[PDB]
Coordinates of all heavy atoms in Angstrom, one line a residue:
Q185 N 98.4 101.1 79.8 CA 97.8 100.0 80.5 C 97.6 98.8 79.4 O 97.4 99.1 78.3 CB 96.4 100.4 81.0 CG 95.7 99.4 81.8 CD 94.3 99.7 82.0 OE1 93.5 98.9 82.5 NE2 94.0 101.0 81.8
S186 N 97.8 97.6 79.9 CA 97.8 96.5 79.0 C 97.4 95.2 79.8 O 97.7 95.1 81.0 CB 99.2 96.2 78.4 OG 100.1 95.9 79.4
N187 N 96.7 94.3 79.1 CA 96.4 93.0 79.7 C 97.6 92.1 79.6 O 98.4 92.1 78.6 CB 95.2 92.4 78.9 CG 93.9 93.2 79.0 OD1 93.8 94.0 80.0 ND2 93.0 93.1 78.1
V188 N 97.8 91.3 80.6 CA 99.0 90.4 80.7 C 98.5 89.1 81.3 O 97.3 88.9 81.6 CB 100.1 91.0 81.5 CG1 100.7 92.3 80.9 CG2 99.7 91.2 82.9
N189 N 99.4 88.1 81.4 CA 99.1 86.8 82.1 C 100.4 86.3 82.7 O 101.2 85.6 82.0 CB 98.5 85.8 81.1 CG 97.8 84.7 81.8 OD1 98.3 84.2 82.8 ND2 96.7 84.3 81.3
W190 N 100.7 86.8 83.9 CA 101.9 86.4 84.6 C 101.6 85.8 85.9 O 100.6 86.1 86.6 CB 102.8 87.7 84.9 CG 103.1 88.4 83.7 CD1 103.3 87.9 82.4 CD2 103.3 89.9 83.6 NE1 103.6 89.0 81.6 CE2 103.6 90.1 82.3 CE3 103.3 90.9 84.5 CZ2 103.9 91.4 81.8 CZ3 103.6 92.2 84.1 CH2 103.9 92.4 82.7
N191 N 102.3 84.8 86.3 CA 102.2 84.1 87.6 C 103.4 84.6 88.5 O 104.6 84.3 88.1 CB 102.1 82.6 87.5 CG 100.9 82.2 86.6 OD1 99.8 82.1 87.0 ND2 101.2 82.1 85.3
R192 N 103.1 85.2 89.6 CA 104.2 85.7 90.5 C 103.8 85.4 91.9 O 102.6 85.1 92.2 CB 104.3 87.3 90.4 CG 104.6 87.8 89.0 CD 106.0 87.4 88.5 NE 106.1 87.3 87.1 CZ 106.4 88.4 86.3 NH1 106.7 89.6 86.7 NH2 106.4 88.2 84.9
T193 N 104.8 85.3 92.7 CA 104.6 85.1 94.2 C 104.9 86.3 94.9 O 105.9 87.0 94.7 CB 105.5 83.9 94.7 OG1 105.2 82.7 94.0 CG2 105.4 83.7 96.2
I194 N 104.0 86.7 95.8 CA 104.1 88.0 96.6 C 105.0 87.7 97.7 O 104.9 86.7 98.4 CB 102.7 88.4 97.1 CG1 101.9 88.9 95.9 CG2 102.9 89.5 98.1 CD1 100.5 89.3 96.3
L195 N 106.0 88.6 97.9 CA 106.9 88.5 99.1 C 107.1 89.9 99.6 O 107.4 90.8 98.9 CB 108.3 87.8 98.6 CG 108.3 86.4 98.2 CD1 109.6 86.0 97.6 CD2 107.9 85.4 99.3
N196 N 106.9 90.0 100.9 CA 107.0 91.3 101.7 C 106.3 92.4 101.0 O 106.9 93.3 100.4 CB 108.5 91.6 102.0 CG 108.8 91.7 103.5 OD1 107.9 92.0 104.3 ND2 110.1 91.5 103.8
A197 N 105.0 92.3 101.1 CA 104.1 93.4 100.5 C 103.4 94.2 101.6 O 102.4 94.9 101.4 CB 103.0 92.7 99.6
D198 N 103.9 94.0 102.9 CA 103.3 94.8 104.0 C 103.4 96.3 103.7 O 102.4 97.0 104.0 CB 104.0 94.5 105.3 CG 104.2 93.0 105.5 OD1 104.7 92.3 104.6 OD2 103.9 92.5 106.6
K199 N 104.5 96.8 103.1 CA 104.7 98.2 102.9 C 103.8 98.8 101.8 O 103.7 100.0 101.8 CB 106.2 98.4 102.4 CG 106.8 97.4 101.5 CD 108.1 97.9 100.8 CE 109.3 98.2 101.7 NZ 110.2 97.0 102.0
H200 N 103.1 97.9 101.1 CA 102.3 98.4 100.0 C 100.8 98.1 100.3 O 100.5 97.3 101.2 CB 102.7 97.7 98.7 CG 104.1 97.9 98.3 ND1 105.0 96.9 98.6 CD2 104.8 98.9 97.8 CE1 106.2 97.3 98.2 NE2 106.1 98.6 97.7
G201 N 99.9 98.8 99.6 CA 98.5 98.6 99.7 C 97.8 98.0 98.4 O 98.3 98.1 97.3
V202 N 96.6 97.4 98.6 CA 95.8 96.9 97.5 C 94.7 97.9 97.3 O 94.0 98.3 98.2 CB 95.2 95.6 97.9 CG1 94.3 95.0 96.8 CG2 96.3 94.6 98.2
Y203 N 94.5 98.4 96.1 CA 93.5 99.4 95.7 C 92.5 98.8 94.7 O 92.8 97.9 93.9 CB 94.2 100.6 95.1 CG 95.2 101.2 96.0 CD1 96.5 100.7 96.1 CD2 94.8 102.1 97.0 CE1 97.4 101.2 97.0 CE2 95.7 102.6 97.9 CZ 97.0 102.2 97.9 OH 97.9 102.7 98.8
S204 N 91.3 99.3 94.8 CA 90.2 98.8 93.8 C 90.5 99.3 92.4 O 90.1 98.6 91.5 CB 88.9 99.4 94.3 OG 88.8 100.7 94.1
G205 N 91.1 100.4 92.2 CA 91.6 100.9 90.9 C 93.1 101.2 90.9 O 93.7 101.1 91.9
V206 N 93.6 101.6 89.7 CA 94.9 102.0 89.6 C 95.1 103.2 90.5 O 94.3 104.1 90.6 CB 95.3 102.4 88.2 CG1 96.7 102.9 88.1 CG2 95.1 101.2 87.2
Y207 N 96.2 103.2 91.3 CA 96.3 104.0 92.5 C 96.3 105.5 92.1 O 97.0 106.0 91.2 CB 97.7 103.8 93.2 CG 97.9 104.7 94.4 CD1 97.2 104.6 95.6 CD2 98.8 105.8 94.2 CE1 97.5 105.6 96.6 CE2 99.1 106.7 95.2 CZ 98.4 106.6 96.4 OH 98.7 107.5 97.4
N208 N 95.3 106.2 92.7 CA 95.2 107.7 92.7 C 94.7 108.1 91.3 O 95.0 109.3 90.9 CB 96.4 108.4 93.1 CG 96.2 109.8 93.5 OD1 96.9 110.7 93.0 ND2 95.2 110.0 94.4
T209 N 93.9 107.3 90.6 CA 93.4 107.7 89.3 C 91.9 108.0 89.4 O 91.3 108.5 88.4 CB 93.6 106.5 88.3 OG1 92.9 105.3 88.8 CG2 95.1 106.2 88.2
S210 N 91.3 107.9 90.6 CA 89.8 108.1 90.8 C 89.5 108.3 92.3 O 90.4 108.1 93.1 CB 89.0 107.0 90.2 OG 89.1 105.9 90.9
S211 N 88.3 108.6 92.6 CA 87.9 108.8 94.0 C 88.0 107.5 94.8 O 88.4 107.5 95.9 CB 86.5 109.3 94.1 OG 86.0 109.4 95.4
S212 N 87.7 106.4 94.1 CA 87.7 105.1 94.8 C 89.0 104.4 94.9 O 89.1 103.4 95.6 CB 86.7 104.2 94.1 OG 86.7 104.4 92.7
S213 N 90.1 105.0 94.3 CA 91.4 104.3 94.3 C 92.4 105.2 95.1 O 93.6 105.0 94.9 CB 91.9 104.1 92.9 OG 91.6 105.2 92.1
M214 N 91.9 106.1 95.9 CA 92.8 106.9 96.8 C 93.2 106.1 98.1 O 94.2 106.4 98.6 CB 92.2 108.3 97.1 CG 92.0 109.1 95.9 SD 91.6 110.9 96.3 CE 89.7 110.9 96.4
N215 N 92.3 105.2 98.5 CA 92.4 104.6 99.8 C 92.4 103.1 99.7 O 91.5 102.5 99.1 CB 91.4 105.0 100.8 CG 91.8 106.2 101.6 OD1 91.6 107.3 101.2 ND2 92.4 105.9 102.7
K216 N 93.4 102.4 100.3 CA 93.7 101.0 100.2 C 92.5 100.2 100.7 O 91.7 100.6 101.6 CB 95.0 100.6 101.0 CG 94.9 100.7 102.5 CD 96.4 100.7 103.1 CE 97.1 102.0 102.8 NZ 98.5 102.1 103.4
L217 N 92.3 99.0 100.1 CA 91.3 98.1 100.6 C 92.0 97.2 101.7 O 91.3 96.7 102.6 CB 90.8 97.2 99.5 CG 90.0 97.9 98.4 CD1 89.8 96.9 97.2 CD2 88.7 98.4 99.0
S218 N 93.3 97.0 101.6 CA 94.1 96.3 102.7 C 95.6 96.5 102.4 O 95.9 97.2 101.4 CB 93.8 94.8 102.7 OG 94.5 94.1 101.7
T219 N 96.4 96.0 103.2 CA 97.8 95.9 102.9 C 98.1 94.6 102.2 O 97.3 93.6 102.3 CB 98.7 96.1 104.1 OG1 98.4 95.1 105.1 CG2 98.6 97.5 104.7
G220 N 99.2 94.6 101.4 CA 99.7 93.3 100.8 C 100.2 92.3 101.7 O 100.6 91.2 101.3

């Protein structure tokens, strides 16, 4: 894991989800907050 500073544009993120933590690393990061 590392800190970065990148500017990107999201394109077709419906297939993926947004998680509160790194995916599947804790109880709170097993379930998406929304889709991308």
